[PDB]
């Protein structure tokens, strides 16, 4: 019931919330949005919205590396995805794309505690000061 | 005078760890002359300790190496204290000696 499609409003508000609160507090960020939970917010951050994620075409090297690795460790996408530097869902889609296109008074009264200054080789007798 | 006690022990150990590092290093590290990063070095301490609790390798891009070898030293000490305490408590619960509501949940989290 809570599940559904992601909205530009929810997604931008997710950007701002993640910016303000920080990465480790999910319940606080899920509190602001409606119809979405904390798990969904976190996985939605790390899966897609995260700026460190690389959204662009795959170069030739990334295709060589992806194909080789996928033939090395079949069906393991969460192991391969960090090695090529792409999202697991993304490299999946691209792979099926490659096979697809490959064929109180202490203050104010009396001076709290008083230290009269000590007296030294000079005359302080005379000195007094003006009012305000 | 107050006597160390079970309620106060974790607080006590971290209190005198903050003091241990503070006295040692601010009497050890110095020449800042004004105030040298005491609040800050301790925040690096708590940061590192959280990172080791989360098993996240903690590397600050800039930092003096004596400060880093410092934090890694004391953090490893507190890790040894915490871990040994965890082992011991699991032994007590295993034998079924201690009935406490808190030490069971805590000890669980530790393992």
């Amino acid at each position: 019931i809570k599940g559904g499609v992601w909205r530009n409003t929810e997604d931008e508000i997710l950007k701002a919330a993640v910016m303000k609160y920080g990465k480790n507090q999910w319940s606080r960020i899920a509190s602001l949005l409606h119809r979405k939970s904390a798990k969904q917010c976190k996985a939605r951050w790390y899966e897609w919205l995260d700026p460190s994620i690389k959204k662009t075409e795959w170069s030739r090297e990334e295709e060589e590396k992806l194909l080789h690795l996928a033939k090395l460790m079949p069906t393991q996408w969460r192991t391969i995805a960090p090695i090529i530097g792409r999202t697991a869902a993304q490299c999946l889609e691209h792979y099926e794309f490659l096979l697809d296109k490959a064929a109180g008074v202490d203050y104010n009264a009396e001076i709290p505690f008083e230290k009269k200054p000590a007296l030294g080789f000079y005359d302080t007798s005379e000195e007094n000061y003006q009012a305000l | 005078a107050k006597t160390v006690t079970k309620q106060r022990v974790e607080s006590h150990f971290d209190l005198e760890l903050r003091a241990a590092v503070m006295h040692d290093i601010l009497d050890m590290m110095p020449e800042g002359i004004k105030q040298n990063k005491a609040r800050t070095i301790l925040q690096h301490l708590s940061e590192a300790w959280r990172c080791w609790k989360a098993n996240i390798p903690w590397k600050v891009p800039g930092l003096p190496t004596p400060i880093e070898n410092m934090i890694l030293r004391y953090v490893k000490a507190k890790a040894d204290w915490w871990t040994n305490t965890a082992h011991y408590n699991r032994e007590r619960i295993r034998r079924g000696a201690t009935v406490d509501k808190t030490v069971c949940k805590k000890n669980l989290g530790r393992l």
Partner: peptide, 27 residues
């Protein structure tokens, strides 16, 4: 300058072996 301390602004408060190739191609 050396004793500038990075502010500890708080966040709270990978390689692979080639043997996998030999194995996988073997299977």
């Amino acid at each position: 300058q050396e004793w500038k301390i990075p502010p500890c602004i708080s966040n709270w408060k990978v390689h692979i072996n080639e043997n996998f190739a030999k194995l996988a191609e073997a299977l």
